[PDB]
């Protein structure tokens, strides 16, 4: 049962043979906006399979000195495929996300990644009064690296980060993690270029180690937007 999984969305599918169940954030599932919660009165476009499909980001190398990695949503996808085109042509966006994180190694490797989805991960800067600037936050498809993962770069606590939706990749146990994120905002829709609802954080709480011959151990991130809606059609900001 819990160990094998197939995810199919649009023209894309993923199989894993070493899942550890999967997380639905706060027990919710993505849905479209109902009429009794709607604000914008124009008829939304709902592209379905053109947007609601897995996009794969660039892989990152797991190293002995890694501090961990982060990507902000929708920012990381705002330039990718038909999701990106709808983002650029529309004032308002709403979606959930399906996050699938991939990392495999041999039975002689050890290491543990915390895979945590943080809502409203407002970052702090270290050792300054000046707030983080636009280019510190808006990393896009490449994402960022943690400066001080021990405090989640926000004066807080890695140890208590399990309060957020999460899984672990413990290389002994499993080689993938899956989190389903609902829409998570104070408004029913948002401008996708100035606010990120979710941050995916991948942090190596136990470092990668082995005594076999070393290999590159990549971590790969695949994200499917779910139930995408767009409102306020205009020219592309792009």
């Amino acid at each position: 049962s819990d160990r094998v999984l197939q995810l199919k969305l649009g023209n894309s599918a993923i199989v894993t043979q070493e899942a550890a169940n999967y997380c639905c954030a706060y027990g919710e599932w993505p849905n479209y906006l109902p009429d009794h919660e709607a604000v914008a009165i124009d008829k939304p476009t709902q592209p379905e399979t053109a947007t609601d499909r897995f996009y794969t980001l660039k892989s990152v190398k797991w190293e002995t000195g890694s501090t961990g990695w982060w990507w902000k949503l929708p920012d990381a996808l705002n330039n990718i495929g038909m999701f990106g085109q709808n983002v650029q042509h529309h004032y308002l966006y709403r979606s959930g996300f399906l996050i699938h994180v991939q990392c495999n190694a041999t039975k002689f490797h050890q290491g543990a990644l915390l895979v945590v989805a943080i809502p409203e991960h407002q970052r702090g800067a270290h050792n300054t009064n000046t707030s983080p600037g636009f280019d510190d936050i808006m990393k896009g498809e490449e994402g960022g690296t943690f400066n001080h993962p021990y405090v989640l770069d926000d004066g807080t606590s890695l140890a208590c980060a399990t309060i957020f939706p999460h899984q672990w990749i413990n290389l002994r146990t499993n080689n993938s993690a899956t989190i389903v994120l609902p829409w998570m905002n104070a408004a029913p829709m948002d401008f996708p270029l100035r606010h990120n609802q979710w941050t995916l954080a991948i942090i190596p709480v136990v470092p990668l180690g082995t005594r076999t011959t070393s290999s590159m151990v990549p971590i790969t991130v695949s994200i499917a937007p779910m139930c995408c809606e767009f409102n306020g059609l205009r020219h592309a900001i792009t």
Binding site: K107, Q110, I163
Partner: protein, 99 residues
């Protein structure tokens, strides 16, 4: 939420959230102990149960400690984890803690 069990000098940042175990050549050796004081500073303080409880003065009820082994698939081993009710010193031998 993770306990800061390795709250020792020369454990920095993330390193404080894990305990390293090695193969020994003597039987039944002690590996670590955990102070159970939530009021005094110790491995339990910066935890979700810890931080919320420190807004209060009185507490009751059971705790669970969960340990995840993060060695390789080929690693094997057995551990004994003991809770000692209060009254005396912390046990330093397995056949004392086993009681």
């Amino acid at each position: 939420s993770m306990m800061e069990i390795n709250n020792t000098e020369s454990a920095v940042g993330m390193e404080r959230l894990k305990v390293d175990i090695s193969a020994l050549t003597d039987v039944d050796q002690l590996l670590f102990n955990i102070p159970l004081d939530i009021q005094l500073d110790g491995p339990l303080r910066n935890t979700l149960v810890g931080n919320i409880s420190r807004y209060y003065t009185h507490w009751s009820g059971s705790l669970e400690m969960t340990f995840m082994f993060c060695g390789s698939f080929m690693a094997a081993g057995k551990l004994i984890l003991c809770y000692t009710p209060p009254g005396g010193s912390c046990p330093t031998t397995r056949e004392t803690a086993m009681l």
